[PDB]
Amino acid sequence: LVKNKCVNFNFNGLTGTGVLTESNKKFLPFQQFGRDIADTTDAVRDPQTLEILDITPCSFGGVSVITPGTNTSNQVAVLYQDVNCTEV
Amino acid sequence: LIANQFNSAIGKIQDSLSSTPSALGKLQDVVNQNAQALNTLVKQLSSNF
């Protein structure tokens, strides 16, 4: 089991990819899948243990180049939108 | 008298905003419409087409 790291997961056929963390939400004993309002997988119970694992999508976002005019300078700054830069 | 009427009017504005659930109807409708459009867009993935 790998958690807090983006990984391709296949729990009996979820065949999805994302970042898995410990879940405080309490499933029902018969329930396995998890879903949000928009009907996308949001949590899966571990087929081996009682633990519930959230599924957050692998961090993505646009890359914006922050530059002054090329006449003024040639230095640029890069913005990774909505991304924690522990994982850039 | 004008000052008291002004203060009481603002107080009544505060109370009427607090009471009526649909006071901010326009803003709530804008938010609901945007969220509903996004929800429809995401739900459209489930369609076989």
Binding site: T40, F60, G61 | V31, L38, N39
Partner: peptide, 22 residues
Amino acid sequence: VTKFNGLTVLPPLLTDEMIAQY
């Protein structure tokens, strides 16, 4: 007043704090 499948919600440039300041 009161689903990440390629959707990004860009934050407003003026935060509510500076809108309140204006």
